[PDB]
């Protein structure tokens, strides 16, 4: 999956993770 945090290179399997991730850094 093309999901990769731009704000801190860490990637997740789920797009909503990844979201959820990077909503972290929001
Ligand atoms: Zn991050």
Redesign the pocket.
């Known amino acids: 999956k093309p999901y990769v ?1 731009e ?4 990637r997740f399997v789920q797009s909503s993770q990844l979201a959820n ?2 909503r ?2 929001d």
Do not use: P
């Open positions: 945090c704000r801190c290179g860490k991730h990077i972290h850094h």
